Design an enzyme around this catalytic site. Structure first.
Site, short mmCIF file in Angstrom:
data_model
loop_
_atom_site.label_atom_id
_atom_site.label_comp_id
_atom_site.label_asym_id
_atom_site.label_seq_id
_atom_site.Cartn_x
_atom_site.Cartn_y
_atom_site.Cartn_z
N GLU A 281 0.03 2.47 14.21
CA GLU A 281 -0.80 2.19 13.01
C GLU A 281 -1.93 1.28 13.50
O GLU A 281 -1.84 0.06 13.33
CB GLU A 281 0.09 1.61 11.92
CG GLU A 281 -0.56 1.55 10.56
CD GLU A 281 0.29 0.89 9.48
OE1 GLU A 281 -0.21 0.75 8.35
OE2 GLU A 281 1.46 0.52 9.76
N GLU B 270 -9.98 -1.77 17.49
CA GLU B 270 -10.44 -1.23 18.80
C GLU B 270 -9.37 -1.49 19.88
O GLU B 270 -9.02 -0.55 20.60
CB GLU B 270 -11.79 -1.83 19.19
CG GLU B 270 -12.40 -1.17 20.40
CD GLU B 270 -13.52 -1.95 21.07
OE1 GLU B 270 -13.71 -3.16 20.74
OE2 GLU B 270 -14.22 -1.35 21.91
N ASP C 297 0.86 -1.20 0.00
CA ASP C 297 0.00 0.00 0.00
C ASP C 297 0.89 1.25 0.00
O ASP C 297 1.38 1.63 1.09
CB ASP C 297 -0.95 -0.05 1.20
CG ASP C 297 -1.97 1.07 1.22
OD1 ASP C 297 -1.77 2.06 0.48
OD2 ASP C 297 -2.95 0.96 2.01
N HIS D 104 -5.47 -0.39 1.24
CA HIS D 104 -5.78 -1.74 1.77
C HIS D 104 -6.95 -1.66 2.77
O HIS D 104 -7.57 -2.68 2.98
CB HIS D 104 -4.53 -2.35 2.41
CG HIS D 104 -4.21 -1.89 3.80
ND1 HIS D 104 -3.49 -0.75 4.06
CD2 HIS D 104 -4.47 -2.46 5.00
CE1 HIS D 104 -3.33 -0.62 5.37
NE2 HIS D 104 -3.92 -1.66 5.97
C1 LIG Z 1 -10.14 4.34 12.10
C2 LIG Z 1 -11.13 4.56 13.21
C3 LIG Z 1 -11.29 5.81 13.77
C4 LIG Z 1 -12.10 6.02 14.88
C5 LIG Z 1 -12.27 7.39 15.46
C6 LIG Z 1 -12.76 4.92 15.42
C7 LIG Z 1 -12.66 3.65 14.86
C8 LIG Z 1 -13.51 2.51 15.41
C9 LIG Z 1 -13.51 2.59 16.92
C10 LIG Z 1 -14.71 2.75 17.60
C11 LIG Z 1 -14.79 2.77 18.98
C12 LIG Z 1 -16.12 2.88 19.67
C13 LIG Z 1 -13.61 2.63 19.70
C14 LIG Z 1 -12.39 2.44 19.06
C15 LIG Z 1 -12.34 2.41 17.67
N1 LIG Z 1 -11.10 2.17 17.04
C16 LIG Z 1 -10.90 1.40 15.95
O1 LIG Z 1 -9.81 1.39 15.37
C17 LIG Z 1 -12.02 0.50 15.44
N2 LIG Z 1 -13.18 1.19 14.86
C18 LIG Z 1 -14.04 0.50 14.11
O2 LIG Z 1 -13.99 -0.73 14.07
C19 LIG Z 1 -15.08 1.20 13.34
C20 LIG Z 1 -15.09 2.43 12.65
C21 LIG Z 1 -16.18 2.57 11.76
C22 LIG Z 1 -16.98 1.47 11.78
BR1 LIG Z 1 -18.50 1.17 10.71
S1 LIG Z 1 -16.44 0.24 12.88
C23 LIG Z 1 -11.84 3.49 13.75
N1 LIG Z 2 -0.83 -4.44 22.90
C1 LIG Z 2 0.09 -4.61 21.94
N2 LIG Z 2 1.39 -4.38 22.24
C2 LIG Z 2 2.30 -4.58 21.27
N3 LIG Z 2 2.11 -4.92 19.99
C3 LIG Z 2 0.80 -5.08 19.71
C4 LIG Z 2 -0.24 -4.94 20.61
N4 LIG Z 2 -1.45 -5.20 19.98
C5 LIG Z 2 -1.13 -5.48 18.74
N5 LIG Z 2 0.22 -5.42 18.51
C6 LIG Z 2 0.88 -5.60 17.22
O1 LIG Z 2 0.64 -4.45 16.46
C7 LIG Z 2 0.94 -4.75 15.08
C8 LIG Z 2 0.05 -3.91 14.18
S1 LIG Z 2 0.20 -4.30 12.42
C9 LIG Z 2 1.93 -3.85 12.13
C10 LIG Z 2 2.08 -2.36 11.95
C11 LIG Z 2 3.54 -1.87 11.91
N6 LIG Z 2 3.59 -0.39 12.07
C12 LIG Z 2 4.22 -2.27 10.59
O2 LIG Z 2 4.66 -1.35 9.88
O3 LIG Z 2 4.35 -3.48 10.35
C13 LIG Z 2 0.79 -6.27 14.94
O4 LIG Z 2 2.03 -6.78 14.46
C14 LIG Z 2 0.37 -6.74 16.35
O5 LIG Z 2 0.96 -7.97 16.74
#
Ligand SMILES: Cc1cc(C)cc([C@@H]2c3cc(C)ccc3NC(=O)CN2C(=O)c2ccc(Br)s2)c1
Ligand SMILES: Nc1ncnc2c1ncn2[C@@H]1O[C@H](CSCC[C@H](N)C(=O)O)[C@@H](O)[C@H]1O
Ligand SMILES: Cc1cc(C)cc([C@@H]2c3cc(C)ccc3NC(=O)CN2C(=O)c2ccc(Br)s2)c1
Ligand SMILES: Nc1ncnc2c1ncn2[C@@H]1O[C@H](CSCC[C@H](N)C(=O)O)[C@@H](O)[C@H]1O
Lengths: 328, 328
Positions: A110, A119, A18, A270
């Site tokens: 990331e 989450e 990506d 991706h």
């Molecule tokens: C990229 C992203 C940004 C934000 C602000 C939130 C979220 C959101 C999420 C939601 C909560 C309540 C807590 C943490 C949290 N984290 C996440 O990375 C996971 N996430 C998701 O799986 C979703 C986003 C949109 C849909 Br439809 S499902 C995803």
């Molecule tokens: N609580 C935690 N502490 C440490 N590593 C964690 C974690 N939860 C998830 N991970 C790791 O976070 C990674 C995110 S994907 C890899 C992203 C990384 N920046 C890259 O360039 O490859 C996974 O490899 C997963 O094993």
């Protein structure tokens, strides 16, 4: 080979393949060189270690690259192979229990995506911020935004219309299975991750959430969930299939911030987009009002479910609720 | 909607979207009109019912369309909707317990593929042949053949070479992960179902099995497995990744038989081919001898495994064993 890692390399491959993701983190980190030069960074979930090495190239004195799982071995190897083992320390195990010798000037991560894995990744980054980030320290990326828009999925339309084509091709009539196909592809309560193009978008996208990832209270705030109201006006005649949701994240500049966007109007990533299908298509027209409220509620009790609560109104149709859940 | 059927319609869609599969059964059944006109047919695993309707169009007096699972409802609907409910009887439940009023003149089925589902489907067809087919009755298709050839997978080569490209693109050296990628994508013991093209084929394909599906003893014979020796000679310089296996089935003519082929040289099908990867690539040259023995052994005890036993020799390399298994 110790473990079957066919699904392993596929995820790391997808990320490095990506160019939008990789260039955004590359340019986003380098634009912060003045803030990173001679400073310390924690890379939360370092994976194969590319973000940790970008931080070193930007001039970081020390990078703690923390990786919970087996790919830590590969990060160790990539760091050594680039001659950076003095500057980048690859540490095994979860960030929640890692011991660093010092608080850090910056956290790179990331975490973004759809589902429970992401989450938990966001919870791990915010745990590390509370525990390890110095007062006024830098988060990369610094903020996240969510967008929603009504969509007409051209790929879904082809698939639903497929059954009406069998009579012409083979000489058997299977048009009676459109209803079945509709219930199967649209009638469920799951989030579908699929890549759309600009012409699938039926109205102006609306922002419904914005997170400043440095905020002191964010962990406690996320407990109540993320969401908002939206209103928009359709461009033209289309079969509306539901809503697309996507994110952007921001990396502060030297300058203007760098924005990594996953919008259908932007180059494909991706991450694609998250699709919320209605139970069946609804015909819209130019100036059809589409409004509603979207709420994302965190998982709490086993078995974990991230809830996506949607209440919406298309033109003169009655308001409708359709709730979704992610269980991985 | 009673049940989540997103994965449901995807399999039925894949089959009807496959013009090679659908035309082969269409033309294969119609070419047997003189043998089917005024006769009775059992369709084992009727799915959405298209093969049962092809048998009616070919002139069958009565078709028993037997479907074990929920898609029986859709087959019922398609038959009614084409006005054939007098001629085509859609019967619910497994063929092993169905009760027909008469022995049948013909059995049509679509059992072919890779894995335990297809092994059990072939056992169900042969159970129905023993129980329900009249002496000298017709099987469509009538026979199956398996082929093996050494291959160079162009898609795998790109993926393995991907890590050596990161330095040019981003300015970080990740070439040290080629070994990791190789162990992950080739070092496992699973069958990979992937579509190849003609230029991936390194030698003349060799037939290693041929089943006449009408044979009295076949059920007892399958117990000992299916397999043979092969020998071939490579066309040119290539990185050999392993072997491809594929099938063809034959429908007798009025005339010459119709052959449905899944060869890489033929138009693409939903079956693709079954790939057996070596633990790592081996360089071959024009006239490199590739020989071995391939054996497919049926599943017997829980937890079911269909075993794929390969012993092979590439040029002057020592003979090597690599065994594979399918557990779904
Ligand atoms: C990229 C992203 C940004 C934000 C602000 C939130 C979220 C959101 C999420 C939601 C909560 C309540 C807590 C943490 C949290 N984290 C996440 O990375 C996971 N996430 C998701 O799986 C979703 C986003 C949109 C849909 Br439809 S499902 C995803
Ligand atoms: N609580 C935690 N502490 C440490 N590593 C964690 C974690 N939860 C998830 N991970 C790791 O976070 C990674 C995110 S994907 C890899 C992203 C990384 N920046 C890259 O360039 O490859 C996974 O490899 C997963 O094993
Ligand atoms: C299409 C096909 C034709 C033939 C002659 C056999 C097989 C073969 C199979 C094998 C046994 C022992 C019993 C039954 C049986 N049935 C199947 O449909 C399933 N099947 C497979 O999964 C495989 C074929 C090639 C590879 Br690699 S795995 C598949
Ligand atoms: N023992 C058994 N008896 C009856 N149906 C069976 C069976 N084992 C599998 N099946 C059914 O066989 C079907 C094979 S796939 C459907 C193929 C069908 N000719 C079509 O054109 O749709 C599945 O729908 C599966 O449920």
């Amino acid at each position: 080979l110790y473990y079957e890692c066919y699904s392993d390399v596929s995820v790391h491959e997808e990320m490095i393949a990506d160019r939008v993701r990789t260039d955004a983190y590359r340019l986003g980190i380098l634009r912060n060189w003045a803030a990173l030069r001679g400073k310390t960074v924690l890379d939360v979930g370092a994976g194969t270690g590319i973000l940790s090495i970008f931080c070193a190239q930007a001039g970081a004195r020390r990078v703690y690259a923390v990786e919970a799982s087996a790919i830590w071995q590969q990060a160790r190897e990539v760091v050594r192979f680039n001659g950076l083992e003095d500057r980048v320390h690859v540490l095994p195990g979860p960030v929640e229990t890692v011991e660093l010798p010092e608080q850090v000037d910056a956290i790179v991560s990331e975490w973004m995506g759809y589902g429970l894995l992401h989450e938990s990744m966001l919870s791990s980054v915010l745990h590390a911020r509370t525990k390890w980030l110095k007062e006024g320290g830098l988060l990369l990326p610094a903020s996240a935004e969510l967008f929603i828009v009504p969509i007409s999925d051209q790929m879904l339309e082809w698939r639903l219309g497929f059954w009406s084509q069998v009579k012409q091709h083979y000489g058997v009539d299977m048009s009676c299975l459109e209803g079945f196909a509709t219930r199967c592809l649209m009638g469920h309560s799951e989030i579908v991750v699929q890549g759309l193009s600009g012409e699938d978008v039926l109205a102006r996208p609306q922002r419904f959430a914005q997170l400043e990832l440095s905020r002191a209270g964010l962990e406690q705030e996320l407990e109540a969930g993320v969401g908002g109201r939206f209103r928009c006006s359709c461009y033209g005649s289309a079969p509306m299939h539901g809503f697309a949701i996507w994110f952007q994240v921001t990396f502060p500049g030297g300058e203007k911030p760098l924005v990594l966007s996953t919008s259908p109007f932007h180059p494909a990533t991706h991450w694609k987009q998250a699709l919320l299908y209605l139970n069946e298509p609804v015909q819209v027209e130019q100036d059809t009002d589409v409004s509603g409220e979207i709420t994302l509620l965190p998982s709490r009790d086993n078995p974990r479910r991230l809830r996506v609560l949607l209440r919406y109104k298309v033109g003169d149709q009655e308001e409708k609720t359709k709730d979704f859940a992610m269980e991985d």
